[PDB]
């Protein structure tokens, strides 16, 4: 009765895109990917039980060019954690992170991670989702790209 989730990227199905793009593809029941009394559905983590949750997210970006430079060298690497609901169709951002980055051709490899976390009042039916820029650069490792939640408190 103390719900949690830890979802790890499922690199099988990662989209290309040139804005904030939604990440719908996650494991919920494998390796570190675990879920309890919440539901992962249609790309979002659903809250089943009112309460205060700690939300967090770790996103890794990486590139290794066999030779030459990146096609574009100046990058925005960002993550957005959003809250949505059936009723409040419109998404609202809970947490944001990342960095602009110059991945120059002077080096053939590049790595960067983002971490965010925060305490949030959630009600059943509310849903958490992840968006990132430059999804194709994502590290597909379960220890690298993941997000999660655990209930800490009741409301009252």
């Amino acid at each position: 009765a103390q719900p949690f989730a830890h979802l790890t990227i499922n690199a099988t199905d990662i989209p290309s895109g040139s804005h904030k793009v939604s990440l719908s593809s996650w494991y919920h029941d494998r390796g570190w990917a675990k879920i309890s009394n919440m539901t992962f559905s249609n790309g979002k983590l659903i809250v089943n039980q009112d309460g205060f949750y700690y939300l967090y997210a770790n996103i890794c970006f990486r590139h290794h060019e066999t030779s030459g430079d990146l096609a574009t060298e100046y990058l925005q690497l960002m993550v957005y954690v959003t809250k949505t609901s059936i009723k409040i169709p419109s998404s609202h951002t809970l947490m944001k992170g990342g960095s602009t980055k110059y991945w120059s051709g002077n080096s053939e490899f590049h790595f960067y991670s983002i971490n965010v976390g925060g305490f949030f009042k959630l009600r059943s039916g509310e849903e958490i989702s992840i968006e990132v820029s430059n999804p194709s650069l994502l590290d597909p490792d379960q220890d690298a790209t993941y997000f999660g939640a655990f209930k800490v408190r009741d409301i009252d």
Partner: protein
């Protein structure tokens, strides 16, 4: 009507009024009791008729090269937009792509999307680098007016004087 919805007090299920944009719901109707709708607090709002007990926070703040198109009312959320020439790209307002002296705008950049350029098909052209200007088609000297003088490529129109 003003628009109603079910509640289901102790006895039956009732037709209660919905709460108007600009308010939240304080008390459900009860037969002899109406829906009690209060105005939203100072920084919150609601677009439409609804039933939530809570209002929405106006958000987020505008970025540097953005301006407040719609101020934050009890009825509307703030709306921020990128100034002329710029679209919102992730965290920043960036200048629309310039379509090279070779190409033309096929999709108007907006405050949310870059201008999409393309190549001028056979029989079209553009003499300039513009973020706004489309591919214009070779002027047909041949018919209306005069005669051809110089074939037009994808970068140049037909040059068409009136002497052979």
């Amino acid at each position: 009507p003003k628009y109603l919805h079910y509640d289901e007090e102790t006895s039956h299920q009732l037709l209660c009024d919905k709460c108007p944009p600009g308010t939240y719901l304080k008390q459900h109707c009860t037969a002899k009791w109406k829906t009690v709708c209060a105005p939203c607090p100072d920084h919150y709002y609601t677009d439409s008729w609804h039933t939530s007990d809570e209002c929405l926070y106006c958000s987020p703040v505008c970025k540097e090269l953005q301006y407040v198109k719609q101020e934050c009312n009890r009825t509307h959320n703030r709306v921020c937009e990128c100034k002329e020439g710029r679209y919102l790209e992730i965290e920043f307002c960036l200048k629309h792509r310039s379509c090279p002296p070779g190409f033309g705008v096929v999709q108007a950049g907006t405050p949310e999307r870059n201008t999409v350029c393309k190549r001028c098909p056979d029989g079209f052209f553009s003499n300039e680098t513009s973020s706004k200007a489309p591919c214009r088609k070779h002027t047909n000297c041949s018919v209306f007016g005069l005669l051809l003088t110089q074939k037009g490529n994808a970068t140049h129109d037909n040059i068409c004087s009136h002497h052979h």
